[PDB]
Chain A
Amino acid sequence: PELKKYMDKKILLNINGSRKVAGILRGYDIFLNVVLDDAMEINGEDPANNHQLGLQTVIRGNSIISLEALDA
């Protein structure tokens, strides 16, 4: 699970459904369960339609499709 290169960057994250979320990655495991920070549901046009989710958020790994390091 070679996520180390991303482990404190801002990551956008495709998830089951079609519902992008995004946040600063904070940790991962052998299943790709991910924990991430400043978490935002990226529903659409940002100034009203997205939603900030909370101080902590964690994903069950099977639900991730793919992820992108928008801040490299």
Chain B
Amino acid sequence: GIPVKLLNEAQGHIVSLELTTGATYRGKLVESEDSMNVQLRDVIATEPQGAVTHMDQIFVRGSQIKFIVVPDLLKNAPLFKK
């Protein structure tokens, strides 16, 4: 269905994750899976305490993702057409 397809149609753009643990990650979406697993590159990261760091590359399990932020351009991608 459309939301998993939008997360696939987001690959190669910069996305922002928030997790159940309260961490936040922002970076280039290298790969995404139908299970909502994602891999990010050149990742700005943030702790639940609000402390900030940077890391090269990450993988995240789908179940722990709270929401994903996608570039506003995609509202006119061909995915949403009837």
Contacts and interface: CB of A to CB of B under 8 A. Distances in A.
Nearest to A18: B21
Given A1-B33, A72-B56, A65 B39 contact: no
A3 B57 contact: no
Contacts, number: 37
A53 interface: no
Contacts of B57: 68-69, 72
Contacts of B63: 62
Interface string B38-82: 010000000000000001111111011000000000000000000
6 closest A-B pairs by CB? A66-B60, A67-B59, A68-B58, A65-B64, A64-B61, A2-B31
Interface of A: 1-3, 6, 18, 32, 61-62, 64-70, 72
5 contacts: A1-B33, A2-B39, A3-B59, A6-B59, A68-B55
